[PDB]
Paper text:
Several studies have identified the enzyme [name] ([name], [name], EC 4.2.1.10) as a promising target for anti-virulence drug development. [name] catalyzes the reversible dehydratation of 3-dehydroquinic acid (1) to 3-dehydroshikimic acid (2), which is the third step in the shikimic acid pathway. It follows a covalent catalysis mechanism with the formation of transient Schiff base species´ between the ketone moiety of the substrate and the ɛ-amino group of a catalytic lysine residue (K160/K170 in Sa-[name] and St-[name], respectively), which are finally hydrolyzed to regenerate the enzyme. An essential histidine residue (H133/H143 in Sa-[name] and St-[name], respectively), is also involved in the formation/hydrolysis of the Schiff base intermediates.
Herein we report the synthesis of compounds 6–7 in which enhancement of the electrophilicity of an endocyclic carbon atom in the ligand towards covalent modification is attempted by direct introduction of the amino functionality into the quinate scaffold. These compounds are substrate analogs in which the carbonyl group at C3 has been replaced by a hydroxyamino and an amino group with R configuration (compounds 6 and 7, respectively). Compound 6 was found to be a time-dependent irreversible inhibitor of the two enzymes with K I values of 90 ± 8 and 130 ± 12 µM and k inact values of 8 ± 1 and 13 ± 1 ms−1 against Sa-[name] and St-[name], respectively. The two adducts Sa-[name]/6 and St-[name]/6 crystallized as dimers with two molecules in the asymmetric unit (namely chains A and B) and were solved at a resolution of 1.65 and 1.90 Å, respectively. Unbiased, calculated electron-density maps showed clear electron density for the ligand covalently bonded to the catalytic lysine residue (K160/K170 in Sa-[name] and St-[name], respectively) via an amine, which is visible in the two chains. Remarkably, among all the lysine residues present in the two enzymes (13 for Sa-[name] and 11 for St-[name]), only the catalytic lysine residue is modified by the ligand. Surprisingly, no electron density for the tertiary hydroxyl group in position C1 was identified in the two enzyme adducts. Dehydration involving the C1–C2 bond took place to give a shikimate-like core, perhaps after covalent linkage at the C3 position in 6 via a similar mechanism to that observed for the natural substrate. Importantly, no cleavage of the amine bond promoted by the ligand was observed. Thus, compound 6 provides non-labile enzyme adducts by avoiding the intrinsic Schiff base hydrolysis performed by the enzyme. Finally, the active site of both adducts is closed by the substrate-covering loop, thus protecting the catalytic pocket from the water environment.
Numbering used by the authors:
A (entry chain AAA), B (entry chain AAA): 3 to 238
The structure:
Amino acid sequence: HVEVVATIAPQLYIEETLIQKINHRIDAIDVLELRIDQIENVTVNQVAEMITKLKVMQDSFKLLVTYRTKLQGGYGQFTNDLYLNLISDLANINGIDMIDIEWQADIDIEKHQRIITHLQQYNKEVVISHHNFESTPPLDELQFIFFKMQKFNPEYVKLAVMPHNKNDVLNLLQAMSTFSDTMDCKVVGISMSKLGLISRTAQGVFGGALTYGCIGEPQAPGQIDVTDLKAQVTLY
Amino acid sequence: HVEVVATIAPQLYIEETLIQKINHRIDAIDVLELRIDQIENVTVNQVAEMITKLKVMQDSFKLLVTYRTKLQGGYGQFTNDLYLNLISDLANINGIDMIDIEWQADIDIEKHQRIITHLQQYNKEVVISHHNFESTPPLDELQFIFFKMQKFNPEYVKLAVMPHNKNDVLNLLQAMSTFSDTMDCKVVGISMSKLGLISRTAQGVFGGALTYGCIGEPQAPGQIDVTDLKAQVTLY
Ligand SMILES: *[C@H]1C=C(C(=O)O)C[C@@H](O)[C@@H]1O
Ligand SMILES: *[C@H]1C=C(C(=O)O)C[C@@H](O)[C@@H]1O
Ligand SMILES: [Cl-]
Ligand SMILES: [Cl-]
């Protein structure tokens, strides 16, 4: 039941060459993730334009739009206020199925619940996400983070962490697995880098709902092509 | 550094057709495991004859001979006395590189140390093995079993256990991983069945030294072809 996400990161012009590679991989892709943080001064209208090119394929996959802030390992240098206005305004593009919203311990909980409630009222599935690109907290802290993110009643919680050792990979898998056993909410757990690759291929074994791959070059530490990732998912 | 084992289980006649399939897979196979417990009243001289056919390939892989008792999930119904005489007598076949000897909590420790010391004096590498085909003990018990088997100073310790859930798979990986961090001894940890398949493909990720696959049909619960298993090992 694990769905394969293809992450793309184009500029305001989605190339015909990229549309072509998406189509060659159509049977591997359940979710197409349009990263937009790589577009300096991206607007909602530019996102709407790019989605017009993708929606022809809307029958073959769900569309997820993700603005990854620089603080959380992406390229987005929007202010928190401009970022949260972008997330809220993405509710109006009909073609979007899913929206990523970032979680960290210092957020305004009230504002986050307002935006999340708004996205869901506009029939958008919310992925609440947390990335640590430096380290992997101990097991009890990983479970704590999943627990705090699920309190917003999102469709998905996503935790991505950087292992320094084997135990860090096992702690991410164990946290995801325990969460998946106890909660209705869908869970996504990533151990990044080649060391954590087993979290991407065996995601379904440990109760996770999405696994992220690329079409060309790795879009995050440890990513492989979605054709190869679908083949991996199929093995487990 | 994880070595791929190809398990074969022939009758006194090793078929030319089997020798052919071994040769097609020569680049995937580091260790050829000749199971012999499927041969009722197998003798050391019959093993010696079969090894004559295999030793032409001795440059391309190590030869491991394994008598798996019925109590430990194999077909061998030799008495403990006849089984331990077979293990000791395998020391005299020059072509054998490795010998599997079974461990369980009720063994005569003195006799086991004598045989293990004899095999090693005859320049055989010892794999001390324990199989539980019904269940997976809790983490502290898994570590206990590895700890008791390593006290014999074997070349390898091998624990194969049957998971009932995700936590059982994670406990096998964690036990193997902790053992590999603290001991010089090589370690092999198998979670059997499709649920435990990640233990076979990601064995090297968690500090394990061997991973077992087949040439045709699965020879143990969860096994895949050694070509596909080598490809998996190569990914991690
Ligand atoms: C979340 C996680 C990713 C990953 O680790 O592969 C890729 C990124 O684009 C997603 O937003
Ligand atoms: C030990 C383990 C095996 C496995 O689980 O694949 C196969 C068996 O032949 C080995 O002795
Ligand atoms: Cl699809
Ligand atoms: Cl070889």
